[PDB]
Amino acid sequence: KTSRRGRALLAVALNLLALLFATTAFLTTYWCQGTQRVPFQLRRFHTGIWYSCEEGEKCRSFIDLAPASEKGVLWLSVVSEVLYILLLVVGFSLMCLELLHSSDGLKLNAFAAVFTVLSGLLGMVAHMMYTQVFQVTVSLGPEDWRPHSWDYGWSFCLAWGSFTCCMAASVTTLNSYTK
Amino acid sequence: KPGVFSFLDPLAYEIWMCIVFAYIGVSVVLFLVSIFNSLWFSLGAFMQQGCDISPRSLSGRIVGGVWWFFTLIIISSYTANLA
């Protein structure tokens, strides 16, 4: 019985780390690196997901650019993030109920796992929507800041890690369900 | 001559990350129908058209159809791009 329990706690643990990555996406230090040096003209952009820093140091609260439709795309994006977080928390809650039974059941864990799935899916869709808004903003030539890099922000990679971890927890708690 | 990259040119790496992850998301659902079993079966799904053995509809077999449609589209677009 130690096996199923240790794998289960391992699963809620991976879910927890995944929540930390979700916060990490919601708390990126700066979304992507950037520069404009075409003298005079010399710049070092460090755009955030919301707070577009630049570097003396100069963080800036741009937020919500890209005119037509795209603002609504951001709406669906953030809402999808919220429901994402909600399904995460529901996952922790149901799994902690299993912990209450560790202190249906399997049907309930299957439920929470399904919520992890819906969370991961809606989340991947969300990140898609956001990358779409970003590439569109760069496509419109963001006011002045059109960095030659912007290549990637590691926190997003961490969001993808949160995804694969939720996937990993669902499948393994279901592996316990297979027993 | 590019090494490796030249094959990778027609479609962006990020798009590859997307198709991979999305494939994972597809992969779990087949097991949801039932941590590796039907995941391995999904590995047996991408390899060939899409999915199998489902006793009429069941559930994720329709996911198999959608996935077939999906990979069909992407490979088509890929080939067109290289062309």
Binding site: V114, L121, M128, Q135 | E14, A22, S59, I62, V63, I74
Partner: peptide
């Protein structure tokens, strides 16, 4: 990525729909 991203959207939508079918099928029993 976008032009295919829409296909990602129909894909995920199909996923959620099929999961719903799985749910009601779990409801019959």
């Amino acid at each position: 990525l976008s032009n295919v991203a829409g296909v990602f959207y129909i894909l995920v939508g199909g996923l959620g729909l099929a999961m719903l079918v799985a749910l009601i099928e779990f409801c019959y029993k």
